[PDB]
Each structure stands twice: as C-alpha cells, then as structure tokens.
Amino acid sequence: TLKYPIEHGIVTNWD
Amino acid sequence: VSPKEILNLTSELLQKCSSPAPGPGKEWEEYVQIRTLVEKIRKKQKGLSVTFDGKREDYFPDLMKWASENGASVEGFEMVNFKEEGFGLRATRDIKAEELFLWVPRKLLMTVESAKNSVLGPLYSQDRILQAMGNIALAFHLLCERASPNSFWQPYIQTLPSEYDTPLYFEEDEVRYLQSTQAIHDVFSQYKNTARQYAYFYKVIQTHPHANKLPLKDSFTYEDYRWAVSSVMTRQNQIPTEDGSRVTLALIPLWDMCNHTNGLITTGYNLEDDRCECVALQDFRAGEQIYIFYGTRSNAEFVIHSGFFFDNNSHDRVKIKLGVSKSDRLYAMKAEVLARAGIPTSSVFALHFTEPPISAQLLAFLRVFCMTEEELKEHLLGDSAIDRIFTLGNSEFPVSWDNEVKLWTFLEDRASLLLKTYKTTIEEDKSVLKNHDLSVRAKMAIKLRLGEKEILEKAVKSAAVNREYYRQQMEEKAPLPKY
Ligand SMILES: Nc1ncnc2c1ncn2[C@@H]1O[C@H](CSCC[C@H](N)C(=O)O)[C@@H](O)[C@H]1O
C-alpha cells in the first residue's frame, strides 16, 4: 500500500 | 487614489464580513453586498501587484532546469496547452502503467515549514490565524516569494496560472444559477471568508512591525489574495514532515501540472529518499496527455475548491442532514443505540450516485431511526446486543423486514421532498444546457445544480426498488438472515 498517498488539491477548511 | 481611502474601504469590508450570518433567507443579499464592496476596492487597485513580462510557456524551460538541478524527473514529458484542461503534461515516450515516471524532492516544495523560515517568519510567529491555518500561511508564502525577485521558487511561481475558475472569479449572474442548491452556501462562505481574510491581513500588515520587511507592506491587493488562495486551494497537498511524525501542507512543483482523470491515487511520499513519487495511472503512449487521479471528491468540491466540473465523476455525492428528533418518544433509546454504534444523534450524511446510494453509517442510522421499542431493547440489553449493533451497517443483515420497508419508504419520501426544493427541474436544466450558449463558468454552475438533482432522483428510484424488495420478503414471510 501507499504509505503516504498524496491527494492533489485536498480540501481544507478556510473558515 | 490614496492609501487612506483604501484603508477606509478595507475597514468597512472587515466589519461587513465579520458580522454573523443573516439567516439563509438573506445570504444572497449579503453576498451581493459583499461583492459590491470587493469590486469597488478591486477597481481602485492595480490588479496583481507583481506580473511577469513573458508568457506562461516562456517560463516552463526555467522550471525544468531548476527542477533538474535539484533532483527531479524532467525527461519523458512536455507541457502543452490543452483546450479542455488548460496546461498539462504530455508524454514524449510510451509510459507503462505503474512505471515510476515523476519524482520531486522535498527541497523544491513550498511548505508551511518553508513559509516559517522565510521573510514571513516574524509575522507568522505573531499572528494566530497564520499559525492555525497552514493553507492561509501557504497563500502568503506564495505572495511573499512572488514579490521577491531572487526567490528560490521564482521558476515555479512564474509558471503558475494568473487566473482560475474557482467561484471567487465567477460573475454574479454565474453564481445566481446556483440559487436554491446545496452548493451555493459553500460559495457564499468562500467569498465572505476570502473577503474577511483580505481585509484582516491588509490591516495586520499595516500595524505589525514584524511585517515591515515584507513586499506586501508596499502593495497587497484584493487580486493578490484571491490569486494566492485560489492557487493554494486548487493545488495544495498533504505530506508527512521530514521526521514522518506529523503532516503538513505543500505545493509540489512540476507534478502538480498533471490534470485529473478517473482512477486510483498513484502518488505517494517516499520518506527514505524524501521526495514525492508518482507512478503511471494507466499506459500513456507518446503524444497522450498524462493524467493523475486527484482524489475521491464530489463535483461540488471540484468546482468550489479545484475550479472545474468533472463529467462522469464516479464519486459524486450530495449531502443530506438527518437526526433523531428530541420529541420522538423513543429519543433516549435511539440516541443510546446510535452512541453505542459510534454514530451521532444528528449529522450530515452523503447520498452517492454510484451504487450503493447510502454508506454503512447512513444505513445504520436509518435502521435505528425506524426501530420499534422492542427492536431498540434488543440492541441495548442482553448477550446478543453487541452482535446486533455490529451488523447495523450491513445490508445483508436487516433488523427486520418491517424495519427495512420503513427506512426505504422514509428515504424515498425525503429524497423526493429535497428534489422539490430546487428552483428548476432536471428537464429544465438539460434544456438550458442544450439551447443556450454559455461560458465555462456558467456551465460549471448549471451542471452542478443538475448533478445534485440527478443524484437525488437516482436515490428516489433506488429507495423505491428497495422498498418493494423488502415488502416482498415481508409478505412471503421469508426467514430473516441470521449472522
Ligand atoms: N479533468 C479536468 N478538466 C478540466 N480542468 C481540469 C481537469 N483536471 C485539472 N484541471 C484544471 O487544472 C487545475 C489543477 S492544476 C493542473 C495544471 C493546470 N491545468 C495548469 O494549467 O496549471 C484545476 O484548478 C483546473 O483548472
């Protein structure tokens, strides 16, 4: 398995 | 043109965008009020503080040379301006599925850590918002380096886009298409958050001595901030820290030029060699665009945070809010069963377009939501109660045929009611798309509102079918499956 998969443009909180 | 007038306008914008929500019934009016103030500030400013003399593609050779000198892969692909996706990577040789073809060492990345060690460091150590929100920190890291001509990251920054298709760039009438949808509330929030943050940091940069050496002290425009947050939201990534014990946010040059297609995530971080690594999602022949899979995000998320709508997104979903009512005579028991199952009494669940429409957690919630008192007691008391909780999320083991009939009836009626809260029908949306000539941004909004309703309509049909299946089992007195 990918130990540290990288999600391109992962959603973060800006509130 | 005077700094005192801008200061007055940003103070007004800060107070406007710091008020509480006016209620959903006036959120559109609030949105237009904030837009009007933002546009007045934008018209009195000079656009991006720093612009570059060359065209975007003039700088890709510098990006490659810089990435090469620091250990990244630079052979086997080229940058091409594609019509559908914008710039992306195209293969110059055949690339086999699962071949490790792209790698980017940590030294090239822009991270919260490199933001801390930069000219932004002193202000970062003082401001509580920067310390709490790594994504905003990355955005100011980008702006500060953009305005620093000798920045190590200039080759990356000069090849970034100068504009995006996030809703921050939409016209008022393009957002108006989203009235009555689920997604428009997130559009409203993004716009108000972004305007509040711009005005807040505009004032902070003026008053904090730690900001004296920043280029932003001399010029920091609304356009700068909109560009910076849109750059971060459309491209940022989570990676482990150097020691592997924590996570951080980063921009990853070169690799982040890949556009999105459906598939699986094939990019991961290699701690031992301290670099990002990407293996090929599928075979790519020479002359074919190289894609990656961004992640299992919905089209609402792709539009709002990534600036595009993806046709045939197999992970699309809509939200549905459900909770046990505190006027339910069985509230206390249902809440305890949910709590023992690890499920809150009230939550926002998802409805999916790809089968199955509901997750194990939503199935489990709906079963408890429709339980009789006798069924609740069997999930609370005795030596099989824990076993019964264990299977609550499993479609293969219902509580009872009656419980299934009730929950699928409920979901069919609720999904039907939700469809009735939209301003247009599915058929009207398809007619608009077929008979009008629209911008890319307008089409993103209309396809988004169409997609919400199509997911709800499929849920109605799937719930109706499920209601019929379990009513048959009930009428045939079929033996209940036992786990
Ligand atoms: N399948 C797709 N369809 C349309 N646009 C896409 C796409 N995948 C990625 N994009 C675009 O690419 C952006 C992510 S960064 C990828 C490189 C980008 N095209 C550039 O020119 O720098 C998104 O914000 C969106 O504008």
Numbering used by the authors:
A (entry chain Y): 66 to 80
B (entry chain A): 19 to 501
Task: Provide excerpts from the study.
Here we elucidate the structural and molecular determinant(s) of target specificity of histidine vs. lysine in the active site of SETD3. On the substrate-binding surface, the residues are diverse, reflecting the fact that the three enzymes act on three very distinct substrates—the large subunit of Rubisco by LSMT, RelA subunit of nuclear factor NFκB by SETD6, and actin by SETD3—with limited sequence similarity immediately surrounding the methylation target. To facilitate the methyl transfer reaction, SETD3 provides a local environment that promotes deprotonation of the target nitrogen N3 of histidine (and concomitant protonation of N1). Most (if not all) SAM-dependent MTases use the classic SN2 reaction mechanism, which requires the target nitrogen be in a deprotonated state.
Third, to verify that the target histidine, before and after the methyl transfer reaction, can adopt two different conformations in the active site, we reduced the concentration of SAM in the reaction, which resulted in a mixture of methylated and unmethylated peptides, and followed with crystallization. Indeed, the active-site density for the histidine residue can be modeled by two ring conformations with a rotation of ~105°, whereas the conformations of residues lining the active-site pocket remain unchanged. The position of the target N3 atom and its relative distance to the cofactor in the two conformations are virtually identical. We think the primary reason for the rotation is to switch the proton from N3-H to N1-H, ensuring the target atom N3 is deprotonated prior to the methyl transfer. As a result, the deprotonated N3 nitrogen carrying a lone pair of electrons attacks, in a nucleophilic manner, the positively charged methylsulfonium of SAM.
